[PDB]
RNA sequence: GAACGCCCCGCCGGCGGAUGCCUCGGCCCGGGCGGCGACGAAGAGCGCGGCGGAGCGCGAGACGCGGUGCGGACCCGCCCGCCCCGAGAAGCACCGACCCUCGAACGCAGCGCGCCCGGCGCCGCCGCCUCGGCGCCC
RNA sequence: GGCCCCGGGGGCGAAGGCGGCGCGCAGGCCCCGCCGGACCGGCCUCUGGUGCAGAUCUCGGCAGCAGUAGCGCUACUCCGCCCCCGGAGGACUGAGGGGGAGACGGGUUCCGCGGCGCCUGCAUCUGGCCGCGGGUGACUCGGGCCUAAGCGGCGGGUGAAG
RNA sequence: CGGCCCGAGGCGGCGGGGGCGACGGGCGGAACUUAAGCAUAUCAGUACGCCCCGGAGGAGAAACCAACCGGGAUUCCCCGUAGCGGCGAGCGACGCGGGAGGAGCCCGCCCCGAAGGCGCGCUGUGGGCGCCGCGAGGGGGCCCGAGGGCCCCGCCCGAGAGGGUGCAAGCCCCGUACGGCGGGCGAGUAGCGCUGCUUGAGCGUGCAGCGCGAAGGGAGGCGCGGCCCUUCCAAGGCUAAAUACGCCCCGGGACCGAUAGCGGACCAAGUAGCGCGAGCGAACGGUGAAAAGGACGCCCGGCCGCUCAAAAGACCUGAACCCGGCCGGCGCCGGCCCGCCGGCCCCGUCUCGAAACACGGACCGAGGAGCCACGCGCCGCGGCGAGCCCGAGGGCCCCGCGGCGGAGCGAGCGCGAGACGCCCCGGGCCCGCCGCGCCCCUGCGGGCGUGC
C-alpha cells in the first residue's frame, strides 16, 4: 500500500507539473481548552480574509487557494494572521525548468515558549493582598447568593 | 542474479515449462553447436537440429558421426544413422539409439531458402548488438 | 518457543499435571465471572470490595476537555527555565529585572505548593493558585498573576 | 479442510467406536481419522513480526561494526585474513565496472582466498529444502561498503560478496548466522562519512566504552 | 519313538506394501483484472475423426472453413501428405464467418399440432393509423 | 541462518533394509559385513502440525479356527462319445400348466458364426458370459383427437417479497 | 357536425426479463449457546430465505460539533470510557488530537413568456503496460554402461536466478545481465398522544401504524413553564478521490510431500458407485540412460540360455504380522557353558482396596490428542530514565501524535501533600473526606487550631 500510494502521487505530480500537489490552506486554532494556544492547518480561507487582499472566490480558487465560504471568523486576530499568510503567498507565487514545491505549502510551526522579565513593584499592583481569598469569593459567588435569598425568605415568611 | 520480475525462478514452474512446451519452443530447445569451421564461415554459434545435418558425437557410449534420420521432439532426441542398439540376429533390422542434441556438434548443414534467410537475419541482429557494445 | 516449555516435559505421564482423581474437564466452575454472590463469595469478598451495587451521580455525557485540568508544583517552576540562564537569574536577583514564568504556555493551569523555592524573586502567571503556593511565593518575594 | 463431507456419530449399541461417520460407516472429522481435520489448525493470525526499540537496533548495529574491526574475531568468525595488511581495510578504488578489474583489486589487497573459499563451496543442500527454491548453498566472504563510487556493477557477480551503501547498514549482513565479525572492504568515502552518518542520527549519542 | 507344535544355528522361497528418495499437484501471501445476456447468456441434450470408447474441442461449413502477419521441417500407430529462394508440415497471435434441439426461451405443445401464405410471444416509452362515450361543449 | 584452512562426506557407492561388535545409568549413539543405487550431515544461533501399547481408536493387510460349518420344487440310464447334441428307454410339470401370448419395468438381454481369460458357488466342448457381424417396414393395430376425476390459465386481488 | 376530455385495437423504432460459493445496498429473521437452573438479557441486529446494482457500491457539501484566545461536506486509518444491564452474566458509542485524500454545485419558489428539444408544450418548454529480438566464455589424462566424478592447467563475467543433458556443469544446449517499438427559501409535512420494534442514548437513539396537525423554525446527552445567549435552515436533487473483494491470470513462500496437502498429483474426479428424491461420494503416483519389452537350442507349459551395469521382466527400494523347503534345538531375571538350581500372577484404568468371576485389549504396520490469538497478574532479563515510546503515515535505514508515568482524595460544589529515615518494620507529622474552639480582610470567604 505504501508503494501504491507513492506511485499514484508521482503520476499526479507529473500530470500537473509544475503545480504543487497541495492547495494553500489557512492557519487555525485547535478547538479545545486543552489545545488552545497552538495552531494547525484548516480547510479554507474566509471571504473576509480574501476581501482583505482583493481576490474573489473564483480568482483565488484558480490561482490555487482553498476557499471555505462556510467558515466565519471569531475575532480580528484570526483575520490578521490569515491575511498575512495570503499576502505572503501571493508574494511568493509565479504564473505562466520550473520548480515543483513538495509537501504541505507553508507548514505551520508552533514556537517553543521563551522567558521574559519584569518588575515586582508593577506586578504587585495588578493583584490584591490575598489572591486566594479573591479567587475563592469569585468561585463561590452564586451559591452564597442562593443561600442568602433562602435565609431572607425564612425570616420574611416567619415575619 | 536475475532482475526481471515476470520470469520465474521456481523449479516447479520451470520443469512444467520444459515439459508441455509448444512445438516452436521445443524446436528451439533442440539446438547444438556449429563446428569451428562453420562458426568462422557463418559467424553463428548455435543452430536448431534438422534432417540432413551431419553430426559428430562425444561424451557418450555411442560416439561417431552420421546423418540425422529422424527427430523425436516429444523426447527431445534425434535418431542418427549408423548408431544403434546392438542387435541379436545377424539378419534382424537396425534399431537406433536415440542421441540428445546437446551431445553433438553439427558438422555440415542442410541448406534451403528459409535456412539461409534465418541465418542472415540472426547475423544482422548480432551485428546490431556488436555495434551497440 | 515451543521447545523450552513446561508442557513438553510431560510426555509419557498420561494426565499432564491435571491429576487422576480430579482430571481435566470442560468448565468445572462455570464460565467467566459467574457465581460471585453464591459459590465464589469467599473470593469476591476477600479480594474485590465494592464490586456490587451503585455509587453516586451519573452524567449522560462527560466533556473530557472541559474536565481536563493539568497542574504543576512550585518545586518544578525553576526547571522550566532553560539551564543556561538560571545561574545568572540567581546571581543577579532583582526587583527590577525578575524572571517571568507563564505556565499555561507550558500547559498547566493551577499551581500547587509542594516543596520550596530558591531565595530569588519571581513572577508566576497561572489561571488559579492554591493557598500555600501563594504563601510560599509571597514569602520568597514573588508575585502571583492571573493570565487570560 | 476435513469439514466438507457429511458425518455424524452412530451412537452406542452397534458395537463400534463413537466417532462421526460418513454414510456407509467410514471414519471422519477426527484428528485420528484418515481425512479428518487437524486438532488445532494453523492460522495466519499468528504474530509473525516482533518489535525492537530504536536504541537497541542502533546499539546492535554499532556493536556489530565494533566487532568487525578486530583481527581476532574476524579470524575466529570464519574468514581468511592471513594475507591482509589491516582489518580496518580502507582502499581507494574510484569506479570499478568490470568483474576482471574488481577481482584484480581483491587480489592486489589480499582477499583472494576468502572469495575462492566461497566459490569452491557451492553444493546442493541436504534436505527437503531443494524442492522449495533453495537448492544451492554457498559460503560468505567479504562485504563491500561504498558511498559515492559506482562499484556494484563490478563486484556483484563475484561469489560470496555483498554490497551495502554506507548510509543504510544491515545487521543481517554484518552478523551472518548471528555471528558478529564480518570482513569488510571499505571505500575511502564510506569510511570517511561514517562519523557524518552518526551525526545525522538525531538526538542520539553512542554508548559508553568499557573495560 | 516318530510325527505335530515351538525357538532359531544358520541358508533360501512366498504373501504383503511399510520405510527411504523423488513430484507437470495442493495450500498461504501479494499484485492485476474486473471483461455475460432477446445481436439469444450460463447450463443441458444430441451429433461430428479414414480406421474412433472416455475426456478436450467443434456444430450438418461439425476432431473444423477463410483473411492478415509470424514460423520454417515434420505429421505419436497404420496410412496418406509435404519437401524446391517459397512451392510450406508442426506451432503462435489477432480478425471474418458457420453456429442442430431445449433453456430468461418467443405461434400452441414437447416430439405431436395449427392459423396464414409475408409470417404469427409478453410488458413498457415515444410517435402514428382507426375508433367508443346519455364526460364537458358546440 | 552460519561454519566445516587451497575449502565439509558421496557410483572407488548417499539415504533406507537385514544381521553383528563397541560406548553410555539411560533416552540413545557409533562402527563392520551383506542388500540398495542418489543424496547426506557434526558443532553454534533460530522455528514447530516434534517422540505411542492401549482411546468398543482410524485406514490397510492378515492368523488360528479349518480342508472345518456348509453345497423346497419325485429322476435319471445305455450307446454315439460333458450336466452339451442325437437315438432308444424311464419319469415329471398336469389347460388357475415348469404351455402359448400381452401391460408395466428392464434396455439389446434378440439372431448367426466363433470361443473359454471372467462369470456360470461341482464341471462344461453349455450359456442371459466374452469377440465379430447383423436385426424391429402400417390408410385399416396402438399413440396423435375427445372428454372423466383433476390440473393449469384469466382485466385483476392480496402479501415485505418469493 | 366538429373541438377538448377520458379510454380501446393495430403498426413502427427502441428498452426490460435470465446468469455468479466474494465485496456492496434493501427487507424478513432463528435456535443451539452463556447466565453453572430459567422467563428479561446474551448468542445476534449473526445463520438462513427473498429482492437489487456496479467495477466498486454506499455516503456526502450542516435544520453539524461545540462552549474554545473555537472548528467547518463524505469516506478510510491510528488513538480512548461516558453509559446500558434479574445494575447479574454480559454489553458499549463519540467529540477534541495525529494522518490518507480532497471539489464543488442546482431544481422548486420569483422575473421574461414559446425566445424551447416545435405532430410536443401556456395544467409552462426555453433564458435569468504490452509487443519484439540479440545474447560471452574448457580443455588434456585416468576410469565408468554413461564423466555433470578425480588430477592438472585456463577463459567469460552488466551474465555464478535457474531448467535440461546417460552421475554435483558459469564455460554442452535453453535461459540470465546490458535495449528497442508501440506510448423569496419544499404541508397531511415537522411535531404531539397511544401502541410495536430498535439503540450505549438513560421521563426516548432511530423507525413505523393510527388519531390530531402548525409558522418562522431546529439544536445545545434529565423532564415541565418563563426570560435570555450560542449556532444552523428539515420535509427536493447530482457528485471524483483516499476504502473493500471471490472466480481467472501473474509472481513469491523457514508451508504439505501420496492415509499428508483441496474430496480430486494417476490421457477420461464432482468421476465410478449408492439413494424415488432432496442429496451422498471413493480408491488408484514411481521399469530402464535407451523398449533395447525377452535370441538360439531341447522336450511336450517347462528347461537352457539371450538384451542390459543390473532383470529392474510388469516392474525403484521392498520392513512387520503370517507361512513353505533344508539344517540345529525343545517364557523373563540370576549363577554357572547350558540344562540344573533359586526368584517371578495380566498390563492399562477408576478405586479405601485388582491376578480378579470389574472394564478395554487376536496379531502387525502407518496415523493419532495443551498449539495459536487476545486480555489480566506476578517473576526474570535488555535499553533509556522524570521521563518514555519501529501509531497511522511520510522519505533490516531516516522522520513520526496521542498515550502511560509525573498527586491524591472527595457522591459532588471542589480542595490539594515535606519532618524526620543506608534498607525493612513501627512511631510522628502533612493532604482530602466528617465534625467542632478562636481571630479577621474582599465574608456561609480567609487564617490559626483541636478529634476518631
Ligand atoms: K498442574
Ligand atoms: K480434587
Ligand atoms: K460445567
Ligand atoms: K459452564
Ligand atoms: K459467562
Ligand atoms: K457475579
Ligand atoms: K441509588
Ligand atoms: K460438513
Ligand atoms: K468410542
Ligand atoms: K467408548
Ligand atoms: K482426504
Ligand atoms: K528507543
Ligand atoms: K538494526
Ligand atoms: K532425513
Ligand atoms: K512443520
Ligand atoms: K470353523
Ligand atoms: K459356441
Ligand atoms: K403489500
Ligand atoms: K432476528
Ligand atoms: K438462542
Ligand atoms: K432453556
Ligand atoms: K436459554
Ligand atoms: K431466555
Ligand atoms: K437485562
Ligand atoms: K434477548
Ligand atoms: K446472574
Ligand atoms: K492532503
Ligand atoms: K549434454
Ligand atoms: K396539510
Ligand atoms: K405524522
Ligand atoms: K440496547
Ligand atoms: K437507565
Ligand atoms: K388512533
Ligand atoms: K442544557
Ligand atoms: K440526546
Ligand atoms: K436533554
Ligand atoms: K481422499
Ligand atoms: K476405569
Ligand atoms: K467409574
Ligand atoms: K471406593
Ligand atoms: K490391575
Ligand atoms: K486397582
Ligand atoms: K474375584
Ligand atoms: K479369576
Ligand atoms: K482369570
Ligand atoms: K474397579
Ligand atoms: K460386567
Ligand atoms: K465403566
Ligand atoms: K478384562
Ligand atoms: K514501541
Ligand atoms: K464527601
Ligand atoms: Mg509423576
Ligand atoms: Mg478438579
Ligand atoms: Mg442460594
Ligand atoms: Mg460412530
Ligand atoms: Mg487432511
Ligand atoms: Mg469421443
Ligand atoms: Mg501431533
Ligand atoms: Mg498409556
Ligand atoms: Mg404326473
Ligand atoms: Mg441367444
Ligand atoms: Mg464353477
Ligand atoms: Mg382404428
Ligand atoms: Mg444455562
Ligand atoms: Mg447488541
Ligand atoms: Mg455512488
Ligand atoms: Mg436492545
Ligand atoms: Mg489424498
Ligand atoms: Mg520390486
Ligand atoms: Mg474384548
Ligand atoms: Mg505410529
Automatic annotation (TrEMBL), chain B:
The keyword ATP-binding does not apply. The lineage of its organism: Eukaryota, Metamonada, Diplomonadida, Hexamitidae, Giardiinae. GO terms for cellular component: cytosolic large ribosomal subunit. InterPro entries: Rib_uL2_dom2, Ribosomal_uL24_euk/arc, Ribosomal_uL24_KOW, Translation_prot_SH3-like_sf. This is Ribosomal protein L26. Belongs to the universal ribosomal protein uL24 family. PANTHER family: 60S RIBOSOMAL PROTEIN L26 FAMILY MEMBER. Pfam families: Ribosomal_L26. GO terms for biological process: cytoplasmic translation; ribosomal large subunit biogenesis. It comes from the Eukaryota. NCBIfam families: rplX_A_E (TIGR01080). It comes from Giardia intestinalis (strain ATCC 50803 / WB clone C6) (Giardia lamblia). Keywords: Ribonucleoprotein, Ribosomal protein. One of its GO terms (molecular function) is structural constituent of ribosome.
From TrEMBL, chain C:
It comes from the Eukaryota. Residues 1-40 are annotated as: Disordered. InterPro entries: Ribosomal_uL15, Ribosomal_uL15/eL18, Ribosomal_uL15/eL18_sf, Ribosomal_uL15_CS. One of its GO terms (molecular function) is structural constituent of ribosome. It holds the Pfam family Ribosomal_L27A. The keyword Ribosomal protein applies. Residues 71-143 form the Large ribosomal subunit protein uL15/eL18 domain. GO terms for biological process: translation. Keywords: Ribonucleoprotein, Ribosomal protein. One of its GO terms (cellular component) is cytosolic large ribosomal subunit. The keyword Ribonucleoprotein applies. Belongs to the universal ribosomal protein uL15 family. HAMAP family: Ribosomal_uL15. PANTHER family: 60S RIBOSOMAL PROTEIN L27A, LARGE RIBOSOMAL SUBUNIT PROTEIN UL15. This is Ribosomal protein L27a.
From TrEMBL, chain D:
GO terms for cellular component: cytosolic large ribosomal subunit. Mg(2+) binds at residue 19. It comes from the Eukaryota. One of its GO terms (biological process) is translation. Coiled coil: none annotated. Signal peptide: none annotated. The keyword Calcium does not apply. Keywords: Metal-binding, Ribonucleoprotein, Ribosomal protein. The keyword Transcription regulation does not apply. GO terms for molecular function: RNA binding; structural constituent of ribosome. Belongs to the universal ribosomal protein uL4 family. This is Large ribosomal subunit protein uL4. The chain holds residues 54 to 264 of 316 of the full protein.
Amino acid at each position: 500500500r505504501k508503494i501504491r500510494r507513492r506511485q499514484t502521487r508521482l503520476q499526479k505530480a507529473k500530470a500537473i507539473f509544475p503545480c504543487p500537489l497541495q492547495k494553500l490552506r489557512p492557519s487555525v486554532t485547535r478547538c479545545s481548552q486543552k489545545f488552545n494556544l497552538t495552531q494547525r492547518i484548516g480547510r479554507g480561507f474566509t471571504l473576509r480574509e480574501l476581501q482583505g487582499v482583493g481576490l474573489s472566490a473564483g480568482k483565488a480558487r484558480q490561482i490555487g487557494i482553498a476557499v471555505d465560504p462556510r467558515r466565519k471568523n471569531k475575532s480580528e486576530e484570526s483575520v490578521a494572521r490569515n491575511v498575512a499568510r495570503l499576502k505572503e503567498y501571493l508574494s511568493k507565487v509565479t504564473i505562466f525548468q520550473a520548480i515543483q514545491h513538495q509537501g504541505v505549502v507553508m507548514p505551520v510551526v508552533n514556537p517553543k515558549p521563551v522567558i521574559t522579565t519584569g518588575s515586582i513593584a508593577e506586578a504587585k499592583k495588578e493583584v490584591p493582598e490575598n489572591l486566594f481569598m479573591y479567587l475563592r469569593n469569585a468561585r463561590t459567588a452564586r451559591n452564597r447568593a442562593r443561600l442568602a435569598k433562602r435565609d431572607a425568605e425564612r425570616e420574611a415568611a416567619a415575619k | 542474479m536475475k532482475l526481471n520480475s515476470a520470469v520465474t525462478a521456481s523449479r516447479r514452474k520451470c520443469r512444467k515449462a520444459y515439459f508441455t512446451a509448444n512445438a516452436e519452443t521445443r524446436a528451439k530447445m533442440m539446438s547444438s553447436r556449429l563446428s569451428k569451421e562453420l562458426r568462422a564461415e557463418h559467424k553463428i554459434k548455435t543452430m536448431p537440429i534438422r534432417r540432413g545435418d551431419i553430426v559428430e558425437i562425444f561424451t557418450g557410449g555411442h560416439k561417431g558421426t552420421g546423418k540425422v534420420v529422424e527427430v523425436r521432439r516429444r523426447d527431445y532426441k534425434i535418431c542418427v544413422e549408423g548408431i544403434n542398439q546392438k542387435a541379436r540376429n545377424p539378419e534382424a533390422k537396425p534399431v537406433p539409439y536415440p542421441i540428445h542434441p546437446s551431445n553433438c556438434i553439427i558438422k555440415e548443414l542442410y541448406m534451403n531458402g528459409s535456412r539461409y534467410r534465418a541465418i542472415k537475419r540472426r547475423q544482422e541482429r548480432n551485428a546490431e548488438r556488436l555495434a551497440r557494445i | 518457543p515451543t521447545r523450552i516449555r513446561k508442557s513438553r516435559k510431560r510426555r509419557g505421564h498420561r494426565q499432564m499435571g491435571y491429576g487422576r482423581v480430579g482430571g481435566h474437564r470442560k468448565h468445572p466452575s462455570g464460565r467467566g465471572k459467574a457465581g460471585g454472590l453464591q459459590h465464589k463469595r469467599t473470593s469476591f469478598d476477600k479480594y474485590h470490595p465494592g464490586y456490587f451495587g451503585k455509587l453516586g451521580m451519573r452524567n449522560y455525557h462527560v466533556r473530557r476537555n472541559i474536565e481536563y485540568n493539568p497542574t504543576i508544583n512550585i518545586d518544578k517552576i525553576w526547571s522550566l527555565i532553560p539551564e543556561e540562564q538560571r545561574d545568572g537569574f540567581l546571581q543577579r536577583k532583582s526587583t527590577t529585572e525578575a524572571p517571568v514564568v507563564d505556565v499555561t504556555r507550558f500547559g498547566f493551569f493551577k499551581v500547587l505548593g509542594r516543596g520550596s523555592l530558591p531565595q530569588c524573586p519571581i513572577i508566576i502567571k497561572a489561571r488559579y493558585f492554591s493557598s500555600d503556593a501563594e504563601k510560599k511565593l509571597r514569602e520568597v518575594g514573588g508575585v502571583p498573576l492571573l493570565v487570560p | 479442510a476435513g469439514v466438507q463431507c457429511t458425518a455424524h456419530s452412530w451412537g452406542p449399541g452397534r458395537a463400534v467406536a463413537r466417532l462421526p461417520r460418513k454414510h456407509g460407516g467410514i471414519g471422519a472429522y477426527a484428528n485420528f481419522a484418515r481425512g479428518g481435520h487437524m486438532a488445532h489448525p494453523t492460522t495466519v493470525i499468528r504474530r509473525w513480526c516482533r518489535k525492537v526499540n530504536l536504541n537497541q537496533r542502533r546499539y546492535a548495529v554499532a556493536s556489530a561494526l565494533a566487532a568487525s574491526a578486530n583481527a581476532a574475531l574476524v579470524e575466529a568468525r570464519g574468514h581468511r585474513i592471513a594475507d591482509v595488511p589491516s582489518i580496518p581495510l580502507v582502499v581507494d578504488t574510484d569506479n570499478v565496472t568490470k568483474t576482471k578489474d574488481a577481482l584484480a583489486i581483491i587480489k592486489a589487497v589480499g582477499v583472494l582466498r576468502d572469495v575462492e573459499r566461497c566459490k569452491d563451496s557451492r553444493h546442493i543442500r541436504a534436505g527437503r529444502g531443494k524442492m522449495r527454491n533453495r537448492r544451492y548453498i554457498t559460503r560468505k566472504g567479504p562485504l563491500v561498503i561504498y558511498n559515492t563510487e559506482d562499484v556494484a556493477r563490478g563486484f556483484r557477480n563475484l561469489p560470496g560478496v555483498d554490497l551495502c551503501h554506507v548510509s543504510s547498514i544491515r545487521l543481517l549482513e554484518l552478523a551472518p548466522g548471528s555471528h558478529p565479525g564480518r570482513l569488510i572492504l571499505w571505500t575511502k568515502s564510506a569510511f570517511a562519512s561514517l562519523d557524518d552518518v552518526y551525526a545525522a542520527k538525531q538526538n542520539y549519542t553512542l554508548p559508553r566504552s568499557c573495560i
